[PDB]
């Protein structure tokens, strides 16, 4: 005679979070959970580890990009999975939204226990697809394309951009430019904010057009640097929002017949393997990619085994790598 | 089109864990071809052992993919035990055959590629030409070395002892191999680098040796990864048609899925010299 709606009326919470209290498949406040059970009693209402739908498999949806950062991060995740005795299935995704939704749906149809998302820029793989697999937790890496209640594992890019800029300030540069990633991508915005913070703290003015947007790819770095090279007041130094764009920066400087660091100092972000092979080797901010992968897998596995775990939004501190570019 | 209950319209790909950009670029091409053909692509990284590699393969097979693409850097025989559990599933090998079999192979023509690269240097007037190879157990590396030898023989040019040096088709191998060449008393005028990844290492070595490219030493790579055109100077290299390779590989695999009795395909696409500033 009693339904879940009977329970949720008496309790005064939504039927959807009574279903979460009975299934124990999401985090519910300890308050609410005692009241839902307080209404389950009275109404006498009648409805881990060993699941028919589980496969000991983790899925990961990654962007298609020629930015080595993503491969390096994936490699870290791969290693962590192996070490934890999980198998990892990957799907590249490109193009528009329906393309990206098709790929995600295919991965889910393969019946993974958990999902890692590593997306670029404008990218929303549909909440509608994930809603069709509600028992499957999602952990987002690097940035949250769409927010939500999903766990997030990333570096601290606000601190990162500040470190990079402060480094240049400490080396005596006052005319410091900043090449950003796409500003609708949160890590790019945070790195720009870190740069602004360091400049303000030093009482340094940022000339108009010293902040230039790129695409976090080789080409964006090139286009952005050529723009900066047409500034009447020429920069002494440039914070390039990632190492991929620094590659473009170097190419631009090479064609402009300018030396690094003698004419212009350059500092990147990521510490991709390529950074240490550049000429000169690239001063950059090291993201701990292995630790990020380990942490992401650890969190996802924790949530797989304990659905009620509270949301994790965790930031690892990056480290300046001093080399020859700055 | 077949109506098979046991198919999933999914292609599996077992790929190296290398971050050499070549592999990602090739995967991207395969992905696009799959989409266009209405197939999904699922990937699994594999890294050294013999177990480990078998775990990954077994996971893919347990997902029930219709066909398998192999894109490896490490040699590895599949367990007969696993293959015996999934007899129905055709495999197409991309770039290189890790193990000898009757499986289809879709690759570039690396013998021609290495010859083109070396002949180019010869035509630019270099006589002291070194060759950095990939791993010698890897067929494309051997073929590129043979192409180099062929061009040098045709020109009647002598190859000094130790002018052929092995690397790992990665940044680090290029660096280590070039350092070795830079300890040769008779110093090369030019180096064919085996792939673009190793050319990145070569550049770093030359930079530390305070040598300019091309003024002191000319460099020609192999692959034409995106990075090649951003190098300083931009890298003269041999372009593999990665998109065409991906399309062809998917097309062959789909053909074999629908027609199992199809005869073995061993197909080689001709690569193209990209002239830039390094040579
Ligand atoms: O954190 C990542 C890396 O810096 C990548 O290189 C670009 O996108 C950012 O969000
Ligand atoms: O054909 C491939 C590519 O050249 C890659 O860069 C290294 O491995 C070779 O076999």
């Amino acid at each position: 005679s009693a339904t879940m709606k009977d329970v949720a009326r008496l309790a005064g919470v939504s039927t959807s979070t009574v279903s979460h209290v009975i299934n124990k498949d999401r985090f519910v406040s300890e308050a609410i959970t005692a009241k839902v059970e307080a209404a389950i009693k009275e109404l006498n209402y009648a409805p881990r580890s060993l699941k028919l739908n589980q496969t000991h498999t983790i899925g990961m949806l990654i962007t298609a990009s020629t930015n080595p950062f993503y491969s390096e991060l994936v490699r870290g995740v791969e290693r962590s999975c192996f070490e934890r005795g999980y198998s990892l299935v990957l799907c590249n995704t490109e193009g528009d939204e329906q393309r990206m939704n098709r790929n995600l749906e295919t991965l889910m149809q393969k019946r993974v226990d958990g999902l890692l998302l590593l997306c670029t820029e404008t990218h929303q793989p549909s909440r509608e697809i994930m809603q069709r697999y509600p028992t499957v937790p999602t952990v987002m890496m690097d940035w949250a394309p769409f927010d939500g209640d999903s766990d997030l594992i990333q570096d601290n890019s606000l601190l990162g951009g500040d470190l990079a800029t402060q480094y240049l300030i400490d080396k005596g540069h006052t005319r410091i430019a900043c090449i950003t990633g796409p500003l609708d991508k949160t890590p790019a915005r945070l790195r720009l904010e870190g740069y602004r913070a360091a400049m303000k703290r030093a009482g340094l003015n940022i000339p108009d057009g010293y902040e230039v947007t790129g695409d976090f790819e080789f080409n964006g770095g090139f286009d952005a640097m050529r723009q900066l090279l047409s500034h009447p007041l020429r920069p002494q130094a440039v914070f390039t929002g990632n190492d991929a764009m620094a590659v473009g920066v170097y190419q631009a400087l090479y064609q402009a017949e300018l030396q690094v660091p003698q004419d212009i100092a350059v500092i990147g972000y990521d510490d991709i393997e390529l950074a240490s092979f550049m000429t000169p080797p690239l001063t950059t901010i090291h993201q701990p990619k292995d630790e990020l992968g380990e942490l992401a897998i650890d969190v996802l596995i924790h949530r797989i085994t304990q659905p009620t775990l509270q949301q994790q939004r965790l930031q690892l501190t990056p480290i300046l790598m001093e080399r020859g570019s700055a």
Side-chain angles (χ1 to χ4, degrees), chain A residues 27-274:
Chain A
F27 176 62
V28 176
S29 172
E30 70 277 4
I32 291 103
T33 291
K35 282 79 171 180
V36 184
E37 289 156 359
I40 290 163
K41 71 90 178 172
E42 187 175 1
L43 276 51
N44 218 256
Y45 162 74
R48 282 184 170 180
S49 197
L50 210 52
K51 297 290 188 185
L52 191 66
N53 232 4
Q54 282 174 337
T55 62
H56 231 250
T57 305
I58 288 168
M60 175 175 201
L61 191 73
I62 77 276
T63 185
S65 166
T66 58
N67 174 6
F69 175 77
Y70 302 109
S71 313
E72 293 185 2
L73 199 57
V74 163
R75 189 176 59 193
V77 169
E78 138 54 31
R79 292 179 187 136
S80 293
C81 277
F82 172 63
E83 290 270 350
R84 301 295 293 280
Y86 274 79
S87 305
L88 181 69
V89 161
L90 307 166
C91 202
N92 282 128
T93 197
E94 221 163 309
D96 66 35
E97 187 175 16
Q98 56 75 44
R99 186 166 168 158
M100 286 182 72
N101 290 354
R102 182 185 186 305
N103 290 307
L104 179 57
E105 191 164 355
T106 299
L107 198 48
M108 294 301 233
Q109 281 171 351
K110 298 315 196 162
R111 199 166 285 105
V112 306
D113 296 358
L115 193 68
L116 293 178
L117 299 181
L118 178 57
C119 305
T120 63
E121 296 171 49
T122 302
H123 276 15
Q124 278 191 73
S126 192
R127 295 176 173 284
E128 170 56 53
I129 311 301
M130 282 163 325
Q131 280 171 27
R132 293 176 180 194
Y133 300 86
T135 76
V136 179
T138 306
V139 167
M140 287 186 316
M141 283 185 90
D142 184 53
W143 87 303
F146 53 82
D147 271 356
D149 49 3
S150 204
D151 298 337
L152 173 58
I153 303 311
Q154 62 183 174
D155 89 321
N156 186 351
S157 281
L158 183 62
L159 179 57
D162 191 313
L163 258 29
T165 304
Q166 185 65 60
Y167 179 78
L168 296 181
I169 291 166
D170 290 343
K171 291 303 194 73
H173 303 105
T174 59
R175 307 212 300 282
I176 309 168
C178 177
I179 302 169
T180 76
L183 284 183
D184 65 312
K185 197 181 181 172
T186 306
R189 191 175 54 77
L190 292 175
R191 283 165 198 168
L192 174 66
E193 288 177 5
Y195 157 84
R196 287 176 173 172
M199 297 291 286
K200 182 180 182 167
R201 194 162 63 253
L204 297 178
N205 187 60
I206 303 165
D208 223 320
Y210 261 41
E211 301 170 347
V212 182
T213 291
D215 61 2
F216 273 155
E217 301 291 349
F218 302 151
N219 235 119
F222 181 77
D223 288 345
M225 189 67 232
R226 272 161 25 124
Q227 194 171 317
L228 285 178
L229 287 177
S230 273
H231 208 290
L233 185 61
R234 165 66 56 80
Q236 303 166 314
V238 54
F239 168 38
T240 81
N242 73 348
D243 292 349
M245 281 193 308
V247 171
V249 166
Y250 274 42
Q251 177 55 221
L253 294 181
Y254 163 84
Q255 293 181 9
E257 294 168 51
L258 296 178
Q259 300 175 287
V260 176
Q262 291 81 6
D263 295 308
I264 296 187
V266 180
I267 180 166
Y269 207 106
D270 284 352
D271 195 24
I272 64 179
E273 188 181 7
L274 176 53

